[PDB]
């Protein structure tokens, strides 16, 4: 919940969001490919909800979000459960780093997510 100065993603301004997005609820998500209910990521382009990467120390999720990225090339994803009226944790697979999306409000609105949780 804040505490750093992340750079603006080069994809933020021109991020393309597919039509007919699902309505993403404010709680109770699950990776669409496994049983994880924590460390889930919503891809800002197609609205897929998938678990975080597996770290080399064995922690983390089951790599479903990253595997999804390798197939679609959709760069941005926001961590569900980190979205507060002020911001959220946004990750860019392309730039391999946490980033700032100045158009997050709009990008989340696309999924029926009002940043006034």
Could you list the residues that contact Zn ion (CB under 5 A)? Answer: 31, 33-34, 36, 51, 62, 64
Dist. CA 94–CA 107, nearest whole Å: 18
* Residue 40 CB, nearest approach to Zn ion (Å): 8
Of 33 and 79, nearer to Zn ion (C-beta) is: 33
* Residue 15 CB, nearest approach to Zn ion (Å): 23
C-beta of residue 88 within 8 angstroms of C-beta of residue 104: yes
Of 45 and 48, nearer to Zn ion (C-beta) is: 48
Dist. CA 19–CA 109, nearest whole Å: 13
Residue ranges for the known binding site for Zn(2+) are 31, 34, 51, 64
Dist. CA 113–CA 71, nearest whole Å: 26
* Residue 92 CB, nearest approach to Zn ion (Å): 20
Of 91 and 104, nearer to Zn ion (C-beta) is: 91
Strand order in the sheet with 90-92: 49-51, 40-43, 76-79, 90-92, 97-99
* Residue 44 CB, nearest approach to Zn ion (Å): 18
A 10 A CB-CB count for 42 gives 25
Of 31 and 113, nearer to Zn ion (C-beta) is: 31
Residue ranges for the known binding site are 31, 34, 41, 51, 53-56, 64, 91, 93, 96
């Amino acid at each position: 919940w804040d505490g750093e100065v992340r750079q603006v993603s080069k994809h933020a301004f021109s991020l393309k969001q597919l039509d007919n997005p699902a309505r993403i609820p404010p709680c109770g998500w699950k990776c669409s490919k496994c049983d994880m209910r924590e460390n889930l990521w919503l891809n800002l382009t197609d609205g897929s909800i998938l678990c975080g990467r597996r770290y080399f120390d064995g922690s983390g999720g089951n790599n479903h979000a990253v595997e999804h990225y390798r197939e679609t090339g959709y760069p941005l994803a926001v961590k569900l459960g980190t979205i507060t009226p002020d911001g959220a944790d946004v990750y860019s697979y392309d730039e391999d780093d946490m980033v700032l999306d100045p158009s997050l409000a709009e990008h989340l609105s696309h999924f029926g997510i009002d940043m006034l949780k």
